[PDB]
Amino acid sequence: LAAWLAQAL
């Protein structure tokens, strides 16, 4: 969850 969204940046 957290790890996936962070990659967008």
Residue corresponding to tokens 């790890």: 3
Resolution in A: 1.0
Amino acid residing at 6: A
Could you tell me how many helices (H) and strands (E) the chain has, helices first? 1, 0
Residue corresponding to tokens 């990659």? 7
**Experimental technique:** X-ray
Residues 1-9: b if buried by 16+ CB within 10 A, e if exposed: eeeeeeeee
User: Rounded to whole angstroms, how far apart are CA atoms 3 and 9?
Assistant: 11
